[PDB]
Design a protein around this ligand. Structure first.
Ligand SMILES: [Cl-]
Ligand SMILES: [Cl-]
Length: 32
């Protein structure tokens, strides 16, 4: 499986896969 998190900045081990809107705020959708 793959796991993704909405983050303001992806970790170095994660791939930035599009935008996630959190509480109205633009975040990255960070997957690994
Ligand atoms: Cl897995
Ligand atoms: Cl799986």
């Amino acid at each position: 499986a793959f796991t993704c998190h909405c983050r303001r900045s992806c970790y170095s081990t994660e791939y930035s896969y599009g935008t996630c809107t959190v509480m109205g705020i633009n975040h990255r959708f960070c997957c690994l």
